[PDB]
Amino acid sequence: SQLAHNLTLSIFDPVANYRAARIICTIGPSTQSVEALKGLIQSGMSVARMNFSHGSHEYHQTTINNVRQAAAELGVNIAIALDTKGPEIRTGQFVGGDAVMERGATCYVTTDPAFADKGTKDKFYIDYQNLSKVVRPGNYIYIDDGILILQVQSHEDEQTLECTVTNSHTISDRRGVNLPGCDVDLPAVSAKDRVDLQFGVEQGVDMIFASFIRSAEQVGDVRKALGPKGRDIMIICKIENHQGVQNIDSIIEESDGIMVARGDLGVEIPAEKVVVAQKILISKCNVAGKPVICATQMLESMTYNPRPTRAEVSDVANAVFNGADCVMLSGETAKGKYPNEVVQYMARICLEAQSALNEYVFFNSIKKLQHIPMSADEAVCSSAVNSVYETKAKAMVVLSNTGRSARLVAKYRPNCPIVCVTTRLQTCRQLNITQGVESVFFDADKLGHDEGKEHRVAAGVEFAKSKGYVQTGDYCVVIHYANQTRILLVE
Amino acid sequence: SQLAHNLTLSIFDPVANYRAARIICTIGPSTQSVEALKGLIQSGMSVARMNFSHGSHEYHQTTINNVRQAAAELGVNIAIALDTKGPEIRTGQFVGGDAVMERGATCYVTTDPAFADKGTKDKFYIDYQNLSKVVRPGNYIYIDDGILILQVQSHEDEQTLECTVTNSHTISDRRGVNLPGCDVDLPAVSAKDRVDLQFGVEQGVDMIFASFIRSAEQVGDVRKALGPKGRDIMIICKIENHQGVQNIDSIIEESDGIMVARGDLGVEIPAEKVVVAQKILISKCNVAGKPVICATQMLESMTYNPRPTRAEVSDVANAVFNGADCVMLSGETAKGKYPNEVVQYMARICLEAQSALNEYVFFNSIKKLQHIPMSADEAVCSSAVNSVYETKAKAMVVLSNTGRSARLVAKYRPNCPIVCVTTRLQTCRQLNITQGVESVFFDADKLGHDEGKEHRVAAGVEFAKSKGYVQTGDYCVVIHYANQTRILLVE
Numbered sequence: 001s002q003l004a005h006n007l008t009l010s011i012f013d014p015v016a017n018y019r020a021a022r023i024i025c026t027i028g029p030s031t032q033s034v035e036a037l038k039g040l041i042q043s044g045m046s047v048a049r050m051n052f053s054h055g056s057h058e059y060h061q062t063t064i065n066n067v068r069q070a071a072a073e074l075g076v077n078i079a080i081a082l083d084t085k086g087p088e089i090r091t092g093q094f095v096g097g098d099a100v101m102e103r104g105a106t107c108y109v110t111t112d113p114a115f116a117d118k119g120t121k122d123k124f125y126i127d128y129q130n131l132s133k134v135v136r137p138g139n140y141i142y143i144d145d146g147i148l149i150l151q152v153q154s155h156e157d158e159q160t161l162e163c164t165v166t167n168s169h170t171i172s173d174r175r176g177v178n179l180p181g182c183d184v185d186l187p188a189v190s191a192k193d194r195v196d197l198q199f200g201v202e203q204g205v206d207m208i209f210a211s212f213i214r215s216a217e218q219v220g221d222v223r224k225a226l227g228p229k230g231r232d233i234m235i236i237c238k239i240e241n242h243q244g245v246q247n248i249d250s251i252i253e254e255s256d257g258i259m260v261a262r263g264d265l266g267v268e269i270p271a272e273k274v275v276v277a278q279k280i281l282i283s284k285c286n287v288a289g290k291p292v293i294c295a296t297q298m299l300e301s302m303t304y305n306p307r308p309t310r311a312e313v314s315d316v317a318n319a320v321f322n323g324a325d326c327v328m329l330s331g332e333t334a335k336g337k338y339p340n341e342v343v344q345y346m347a348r349i350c351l352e353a354q355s356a357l358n359e360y361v362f363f364n365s366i367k368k369l370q371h372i373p374m375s376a377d378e379a380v381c382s383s384a385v386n387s388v389y390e391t392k393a394k395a396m397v398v399l400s401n402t403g404r405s406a407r408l409v410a411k412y413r414p415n416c417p418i419v420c421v422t423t424r425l426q427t428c429r430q431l432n433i434t435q436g437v438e439s440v441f442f443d444a445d446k447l448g449h450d451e452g453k454e455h456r457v458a459a460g461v462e463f464a465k466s467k468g469y470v471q472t473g474d475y476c477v478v479i480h481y482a483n484q485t486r487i488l489l490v491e
Numbered sequence: 492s493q494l495a496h497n498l499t500l501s502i503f504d505p506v507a508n509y510r511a512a513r514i515i516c517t518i519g520p521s522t523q524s525v526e527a528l529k530g531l532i533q534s535g536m537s538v539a540r541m542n543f544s545h546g547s548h549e550y551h552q553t554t555i556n557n558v559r560q561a562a563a564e565l566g567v568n569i570a571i572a573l574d575t576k577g578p579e580i581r582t583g584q585f586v587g588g589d590a591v592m593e594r595g596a597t598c599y600v601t602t603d604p605a606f607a608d609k610g611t612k613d614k615f616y617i618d619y620q621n622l623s624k625v626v627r628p629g630n631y632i633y634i635d636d637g638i639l640i641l642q643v644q645s646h647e648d649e650q651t652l653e654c655t656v657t658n659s660h661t662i663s664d665r666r667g668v669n670l671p672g673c674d675v676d677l678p679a680v681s682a683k684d685r686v687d688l689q690f691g692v693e694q695g696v697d698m699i700f701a702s703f704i705r706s707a708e709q710v711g712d713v714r715k716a717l718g719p720k721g722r723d724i725m726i727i728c729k730i731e732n733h734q735g736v737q738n739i740d741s742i743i744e745e746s747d748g749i750m751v752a753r754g755d756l757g758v759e760i761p762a763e764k765v766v767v768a769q770k771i772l773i774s775k776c777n778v779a780g781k782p783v784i785c786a787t788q789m790l791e792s793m794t795y796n797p798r799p800t801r802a803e804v805s806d807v808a809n810a811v812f813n814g815a816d817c818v819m820l821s822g823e824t825a826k827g828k829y830p831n832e833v834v835q836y837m838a839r840i841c842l843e844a845q846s847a848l849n850e851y852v853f854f855n856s857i858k859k860l861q862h863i864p865m866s867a868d869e870a871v872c873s874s875a876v877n878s879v880y881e882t883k884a885k886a887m888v889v890l891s892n893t894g895r896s897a898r899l900v901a902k903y904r905p906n907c908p909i910v911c912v913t914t915r916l917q918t919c920r921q922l923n924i925t926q927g928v929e930s931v932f933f934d935a936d937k938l939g940h941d942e943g944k945e946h947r948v949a950a951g952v953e954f955a956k957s958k959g960y961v962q963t964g965d966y967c968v969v970i971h972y973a974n975q976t977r978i979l980l981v982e
């Protein structure tokens with residue numbers, strides 16, 4: 001039982017020689033330079049997220065050009081993700097890049113597209129036109145992931161509302177406004193996004209973090225909007241509203257993965273239930289084998305201090321325990337004072353949680369919840385991981401070009417690193433979001449086709465030998481769709 | 492649980508398309524002819540046992556020559572086993588081939604080597620010389636697997652005892668006499684046996700059923716006596732005395748397999764404890780992977796009637812449930828009136844027990860009791876059977892020349908037939924004692940070495956296709972020591 005395994009732990013227990021959980025960071029003013037991006041990569045960042053709710057196509061271009069440059073200079077594959085705007089509502093900019101709203105103070109929310117560029121604590125912009133008709137005196141307006149709340153007192157015209165500010169808090173530019181239960185009709189796939197998405201395909205982003213997904217049909221609209229040029233790009237659905245959670249089943253089916261975007265969720269649903277939701281999504285992904293990302297406010301206080309609170313630590317670790325493939329840093333790196341220290345601490349908390357975990361349980365639990373009869377190749381991965389546990393193999397080698405086989409292995413949670421040998425360089429970046437995998441690029445255009453698998457398999461084992469996973473005389477399990485599995489001794 | 496699985500059963504449930512348990516018969520006057528031996532092979536006999544406690548080397552020769560002839564004419568591999576005399580004590584022959592001892596009647600047991608050829612109900616021979624010194628008035632003498640008991644009244648000379656016969660019963664020639672607790676010193680490996688064993692090596696017997704094994708050292712004495720010429724012959728230790736059971740651990744280690752010879756055991760230990768012993772031996776073999784045979788009086792009443800009692804049925808089935816690889820017929824075929832009917836009924840009871848069993852439990856139970864870390868090749872077989880269960884594969888193909896890999900697979904109890912492809916014809920016979928395996932002879936001297944494994948693997952699948960195990964589009968798992976495993980679709 002879980003209680004029995006807790007008794008066997010010790011603070012002194014040596015950490016694993018590899019990290020499994022994958023870190024994702026958000027690139028902002030604090031982290032756009034190559035000299036900072038290199039910092040994040042060495043500190044533990046696997047994926048760079050670009051939030052398209054801020055900055056121009058001119059800005060994100062620079063992010064892309066610098067992420068890639070910092071990667072090549074360090075000799076690693078780092079993935080780039082586009083995060084769509086979606087059917088959100090955003091405030092407008094402010095004079096001084098921010099506003100300081102105080103408890104008791106009164107403010108003005110206009111829908112005048114000329115209060116976009118200028119924003120006081122007294123008056124600012126909200127980019128939903130119909131706003132005046134959606135609200136009544138008494139109803140709240142939530143600013144910034146449910147932190148700041150304004151109570152509506154009255155109208156002023158057919159554009160502006162008088163609003164009591166109920167709590168003190170500083171807001172910067174373009175904070176998300178959230179209206180709970182207001183049936184707020186907004187383009188399931190907005191015009192701004194079709195623009196944003198096609199830019200992603202052209203520059204060659206590795207994955208799309210689709211915001212505010214609510215239905216299966218909605219995901220199709222995204223992939224259809226990506227065009228035939230971007231069929232290879234992954235679609236990670238951000239579950240952050242009431243219905244998205246209720247329709248999780250069918251969304252997972254269409255999607256390539258899930259993000260528990262807790263910021264918006266923690267407003268749209270009663271905050272205590274966010275916890276239940278987390279569990280549900282994560283585990284449901286674990287069963288399917290589609291990577292899951294936990295995100296938002298996990299290390300919030302490290303935007304200011306150099307050390308997280310005991311709650312914040314708890315969160316990161318407990319998330320890894322819940323089965324999250326990926327943990328993600330938002331404002332913590334985008335505008336934080338400690339962008340390297342925040343990544344290091346997360347990588348370290350991840351190791352600790354992962355070492356004090358029993359992966360063997362995860363393996364059996366997942367296997368139990370699989371529909372017998374399994375497919376040909378899924379059984380192979382299953383059993384080949386069952387092989388790892390019985391043999392205490394210190395590494396695994398999988399040959400997947402598309403990436404499927406690699407993930408399908410990681411699905412069954414082995415207690416060793418999974419080395420994935422692929423000929424396609426994109427697959428290496430796209431695997432930076434599935435847990436406990438490392439990718440090795442086998443250059444097809446200068447080392448030959450190798451339909452004998454001989455040179456590739458031995459390349460993966462060399463990577464294992466170099467990273468110090470296996471020595472001379474340790475066991476390594478090798479799979480290659482993949483329908484053949486072998487256990488070999490290493491020289 | 493076991494109780495839960497019992498509720499899911501039904502008398503109407505269709506039987507498996509293959510039998511797993513292996514039948515072994517004893518060749519006697521009823522079954523020595525080729526026209527009868529063919530009968531036994533078609534009725535379900537896998538192995539022919541020769542009991543060397545009866546008949547000359549001239550007699551057993553004929554058995555060998557006819558078993559082999561009946562095999563070749565039917566086109567199957569049937570194994571031949573030698574069953575040693577051991578440190579036993581046997582009565583002497585009788586005028587009329589038998590004696591009828593009645594309750595109340597008085598009899599004479601002489602140790603005169605001239606009452607060997609003539610034997611009355613009044614007087615016969617017992618081939619232990621020291622007998623007169625081992626017994627006292629009051630002590631019993633057990634004749635014929637503990638059926639007939641004589642109470643010693645007095646001496647008559649320095650050769651003969653006066654004995655009350657306490658129960659009525661007919662005994663034929665050379666019934667085994669058993670003396671409980673009498674520390675009876677007898678050559679651990681007797682002179683008669685070294686003669687018998689060397690005859691086995693010359694004619695080329697497939698396995699030795701070593702009688703009355705009591706220690707590890709004792710098994711060595713057998714293999715050492717077999718010489719370097721018979722290193723390939725298997726040594727099945729017959730546990731049938733007090734110490735043999737107590738030293739089971741170390742005996743298993745040295746031996747190639749165990750037989751629970753219950754006849755002699757049921758005298759040497761308190762008959763109710765035979766049941767506990769059975770369980771212990773069998774399960775201990777199951778854990779090691781060394782085949783176990785259950786034997787003696789399993790279908791006794793079918794030496795006379797054409798239908799077994801409800802106890803006798805119970806026994807055969809319950810034995811298969813206990814985990815026995817092999818069930819063996821002794822007097823039932825050797826001198827029975829229904830030698831074909833007795834084999835058919837056993838094959839049928841075996842199917843029924845085997846169909847109403849959950850092999851999946853056996854698989855997990857055995858796997859649990861394996862020392863982690865497993866060997867390279869043992870994990871492969873383990874996981875490759877784990878593959879069979881998840882994929883509902885209807886057959887398995889293993890390439891083992893020596894036979895080890897084949898057995899090591901059968902160790903983990905899959906729910907399908909195991910087709911074993913071997914180049915050596917002996918291995919086919921020697922596999923006739925491990926459960927749920929069928930052997931296919933791949934002729935090495937007229938079909939080539941085939942170090943690519945291609946032609947052999949496809950030969951095993953053809954056997955599966957011919958026996959109607961797999962159709963077009965079913966799953967078959969293929970292993971080849973064996974350190975590579977594949978799951979393939981069939982054409």
Ligand SMILES: Nc1ncnc2c1ncn2[C@@H]1O[C@H](COP(=O)(O)OP(=O)(O)OP(=O)(O)O)[C@@H](O)[C@H]1O
Pocket residue numbers: 026027028029051053054055083145172173174175176263264330331334335
């Ligand atoms: N490209 C950027 N330029 C300027 N500021 C940014 C940028 N990306 C993030 N930020 C700052 O970091 C904060 C949080 O970043 P994050 O990517 O989590 O977006 P968010 O506002 O929380 O919206 P979402 O709900 O999509 O996460 C933003 O409010 C913003 O002030």
Ligand SMILES: Nc1ncnc2c1ncn2[C@@H]1O[C@H](COP(=O)(O)OP(=O)(O)OP(=O)(O)O)[C@@H](O)[C@H]1O
Pocket residue numbers: 517518519520542544545546574636663664665666667754755821822825826
């Ligand atoms: N080759 C044979 N020739 C004649 N009779 C035989 C032969 N084999 C077996 N029998 C008869 O069958 C009976 C039982 O056969 P079985 O092989 O079980 O030997 P057993 O006497 O029970 O000794 P063991 O304890 O070795 O089994 C014998 O008592 C004997 O009468």
Ligand SMILES: O=C([O-])C(=O)[O-]
Pocket residue numbers: 145211238240261262263264265295296
């Ligand atoms: O969209 C998000 O990432 C959130 O709301 O946290």
Ligand SMILES: O=C([O-])C(=O)[O-]
Pocket residue numbers: 636702729731752753754755756786787
């Ligand atoms: O030796 C035997 O086979 C017995 O005693 O049953």
Ligand SMILES: [K+]
Pocket residue numbers: 051052053083084085086211
């Ligand atoms: K967004």
Ligand SMILES: [K+]
Pocket residue numbers: 542543544574575576577702
């Ligand atoms: K014997």
Ligand SMILES: [Mg+2]
Pocket residue numbers: 211212240261264
């Ligand atoms: Mg959002």
Ligand SMILES: [Mg+2]
Pocket residue numbers: 145263296330
């Ligand atoms: Mg956020």
Ligand SMILES: [Mg+2]
Pocket residue numbers: 702703731752755
């Ligand atoms: Mg015996």
Ligand SMILES: [Mg+2]
Pocket residue numbers: 636754787821
């Ligand atoms: Mg017997």
